[PDB]
Amino acid sequence: MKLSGVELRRVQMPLVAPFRTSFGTQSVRELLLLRAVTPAGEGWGECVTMAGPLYSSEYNDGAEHVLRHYLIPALLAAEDITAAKVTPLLAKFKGHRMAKGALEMAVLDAELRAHERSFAAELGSVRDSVPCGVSVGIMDTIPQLLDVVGGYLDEGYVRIKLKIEPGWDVEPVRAVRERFGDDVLLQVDANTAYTLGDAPQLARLDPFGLLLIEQPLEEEDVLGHAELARRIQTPICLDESIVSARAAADAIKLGAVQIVNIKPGRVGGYLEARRVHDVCAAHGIPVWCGDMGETGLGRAANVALASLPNFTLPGDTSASDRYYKTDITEPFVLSGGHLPVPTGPGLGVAPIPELLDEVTTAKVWIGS
Amino acid sequence: MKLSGVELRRVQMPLVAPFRTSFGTQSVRELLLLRAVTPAGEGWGECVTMAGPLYSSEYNDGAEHVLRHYLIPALLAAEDITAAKVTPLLAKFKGHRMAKGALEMAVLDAELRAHERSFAAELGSVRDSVPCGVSVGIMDTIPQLLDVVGGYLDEGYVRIKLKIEPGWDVEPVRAVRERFGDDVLLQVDANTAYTLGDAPQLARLDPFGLLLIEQPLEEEDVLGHAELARRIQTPICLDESIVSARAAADAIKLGAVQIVNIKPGRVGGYLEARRVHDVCAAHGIPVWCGDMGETGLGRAANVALASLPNFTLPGDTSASDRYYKTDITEPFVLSGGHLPVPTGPGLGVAPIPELLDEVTTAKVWIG
Numbered sequence A: 001m002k003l004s005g006v007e008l009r010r011v012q013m014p015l016v017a018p019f020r021t022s023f024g025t026q027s028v029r030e031l032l033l034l035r036a037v038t039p040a041g042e043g044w045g046e047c048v049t050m051a052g053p054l055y056s057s058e059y060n061d062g063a064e065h066v067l068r069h070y071l072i073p074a075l076l077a078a079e080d081i082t083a084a085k086v087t088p089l090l091a092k093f094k095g096h097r098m099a100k101g102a103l104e105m106a107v108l109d110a111e112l113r114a115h116e117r118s119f120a121a122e123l124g125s126v127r128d129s130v131p132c133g134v135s136v137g138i139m140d141t142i143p144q145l146l147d148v149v150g151g152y153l154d155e156g157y158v159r160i161k162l163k164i165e166p167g168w169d170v171e172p173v174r175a176v177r178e179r180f181g182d183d184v185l186l187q188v189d190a191n192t193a194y195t196l197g198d199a200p201q202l203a204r205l206d207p208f209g210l211l212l213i214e215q216p217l218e219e220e221d222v223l224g225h226a227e228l229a230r231r232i233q234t235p236i237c238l239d240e241s242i243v244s245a246r247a248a249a250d251a252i253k254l255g256a257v258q259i260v261n262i263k264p265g266r267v268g269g270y271l272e273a274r275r276v277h278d279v280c281a282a283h284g285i286p287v288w289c290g291d292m293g294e295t296g297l298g299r300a301a302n303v304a305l306a307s308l309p310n311f312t313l314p315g316d317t318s319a320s321d322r323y324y325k326t327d328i329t330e331p332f333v334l335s336g337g338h339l340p341v342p343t344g345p346g347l348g349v350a351p352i353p354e355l356l357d358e359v360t361t362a363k364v365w366i367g368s
Numbered sequence B: 001m002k003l004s005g006v007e008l009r010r011v012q013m014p015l016v017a018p019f020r021t022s023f024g025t026q027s028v029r030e031l032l033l034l035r036a037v038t039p040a041g042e043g044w045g046e047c048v049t050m051a052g053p054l055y056s057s058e059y060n061d062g063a064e065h066v067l068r069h070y071l072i073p074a075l076l077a078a079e080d081i082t083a084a085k086v087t088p089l090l091a092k093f094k095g096h097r098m099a100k101g102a103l104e105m106a107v108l109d110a111e112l113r114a115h116e117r118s119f120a121a122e123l124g125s126v127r128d129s130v131p132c133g134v135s136v137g138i139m140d141t142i143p144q145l146l147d148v149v150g151g152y153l154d155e156g157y158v159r160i161k162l163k164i165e166p167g168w169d170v171e172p173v174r175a176v177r178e179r180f181g182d183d184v185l186l187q188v189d190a191n192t193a194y195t196l197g198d199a200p201q202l203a204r205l206d207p208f209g210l211l212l213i214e215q216p217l218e219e220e221d222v223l224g225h226a227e228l229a230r231r232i233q234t235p236i237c238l239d240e241s242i243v244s245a246r247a248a249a250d251a252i253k254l255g256a257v258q259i260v261n262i263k264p265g266r267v268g269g270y271l272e273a274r275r276v277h278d279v280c281a282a283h284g285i286p287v288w289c290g291d292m293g294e295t296g297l298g299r300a301a302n303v304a305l306a307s308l309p310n311f312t313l314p315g316d317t318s319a320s321d322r323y324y325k326t327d328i329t330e331p332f333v334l335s336g337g338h339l340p341v342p343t344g345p346g347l348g349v350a351p352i353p354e355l356l357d358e359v360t361t362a363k364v365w366i367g
């Protein structure tokens, strides 16, 4: 098929409750959507960049720019396009993975819609539904955290992940363990906020039986993580560092990681995410599905991905209402702690135009 | 000191001759300059991004953007500023090293100009001049390459580096060795164009006594390089992979590298570059100064950097007229194969306003 053009939307969606992370607080989610147009029909992609370069180097304005001036033109110029061929067509351009991933997603949704095939089917789903956990931010006070956690447990979420940062690590975990007991699946995530010198402090988490600690150190410090794993008992999970299947293989060979968070956007797409899944599986490394506050479009693709065989831990693909009062698609609703895998062609969901329009702040067409 | 504001310039300078690399051909250099203004006075920084993200992920429009909307504001908002404090003030922002490095350069030039101290002095120079090599692009034909190389040798350049790429590796090297002999300092640079599966082809370079092969594989594939080093005799040098002092330490511990190319911009600044120099030195790893076609401003800072003790191989800091008929500063002129280290305060050079203006395509003030 030949790409006719792509529409770039900016979109802005308020969060039910502000969400605090070691790199800041977020009240509203600003994001990029893409509508790829082909002779056959349309498909949708979502970019997981944030407003500024605080989680990784990519951010909304920068992704929009590289998409407009480099990535989309290079696809418009090709005689034939496949989702798979996206990667080699964009290979000359270094990095910009979240951007490439978004564009691949859109192309893929189009391709698959035209073959009446689901994201699940293409990726290799073996399950109709997936158990879901929830990620809980940093709070101002312990009792406030305990209320939020108890709330998410009552809704039937299967696992709790706490954001952490120097100043907020051992106490919150101790408190959650004293209140809710030792049988709750419990894990933490630093989003890079520690250094190796903080090892004794992270070792203080040893006694609380956490599943894992996620990205304690900076993105590039793979060897540091392997050192850290020799000094603590909590298993290391990597997120930011895992930018590709190769990077996963490398981190595993070096003993830097025992469990991997897959975020499709972070690795340059759903197809590379499948590869990460398979590489980890070949080494005995469990994976789970990460989340970047996606709309229902990305959430639908993530739920499909999380239904692959080696996703053996609950993911962060929480229900739509954990982030948004009003999703721009048919919302995802937790049911017995699980989310159901979409069945339609492509994503198996699409934006409801009235809701999308409420929430769109800009729109531009990139054609021939 | 309190940063008053920064001026961003986009400039455009034609190259004496087009320059071909494994990621493409370039006829004109578009670049970003920064003029940092303080109560004390001014300083200059240069960004080494290119027009598009072909060498790394950063490019001119993208750097300008992250500078304008993130990096410069975060410095303007600080009570007190030092070159050293730039790093922690900008640490919340991930990556954008070439951009940060350009900004740090400008702040540093200002700070040092105010203390009447040279870049050389601040960085730890031990030499007044530095031996200079030259980088030669991919050519359409072998005889055309041989003419260009013979030319640079007549001008007295001390070492030759050839750009390489699948299709253009063993033949160009063989030809240069047959024509100019075994005593010429000779090396190659792939700018990431091979994979580990190309090992037998790179092993084909074994017999030609190259000083090194630079960045045969992709930026992130450090372990791959260590594997490659076990299968070839040419020493591995890394460039694109060496984004920081830590990354240099990591690559060295893994045996992925025996010689390191320092590009200040690529590592986030002249200060981090000094750290890369010192880390490599502590591990017995020689370094040499890389080049991104800088103007005389960046060239002046680089020559100063290259005068540090562990720069023991000739760098790519070639003379101004290797790239530009007309530099925007007092030009650098090769003399007995060397370039002299600037002596004035800061960079020791500044743009000649009439020259800069002819070549400026845009200009904006951030205050």
Ligand SMILES: CC(=O)N[C@@H](Cc1ccc2ccccc2c1)C(=O)O
Pocket: A019, A021, A026, A029, A050, A055, A135, A136, A189, A191, A239, A290, A291, A292, A293, A316, A323
């Ligand atoms: C899912 C999780 O806890 N965090 C993501 C980071 C992240 C990034 C952007 C977000 C935007 C809106 C809401 C949550 C967000 C979470 C991660 O695991 O690092």
Ligand SMILES: CC(=O)N[C@@H](Cc1ccc2ccccc2c1)C(=O)O
Pocket: B019, B021, B026, B029, B050, B055, B135, B136, B189, B191, B239, B290, B291, B292, B293, B316, B323
């Ligand atoms: C110095 C060298 O041979 N190459 C640089 C890449 C490079 C990049 C951009 C350039 C722009 C104009 C002229 C030369 C350029 C060289 C390097 O080592 O990777």
Ligand SMILES: [Mg+2]
Pocket: A189, A191, A214, A215, A239, A240, A261
């Ligand atoms: Mg995470």
Ligand SMILES: [Mg+2]
Pocket: B189, B191, B214, B215, B239, B240, B261, B290
């Ligand atoms: Mg190089």
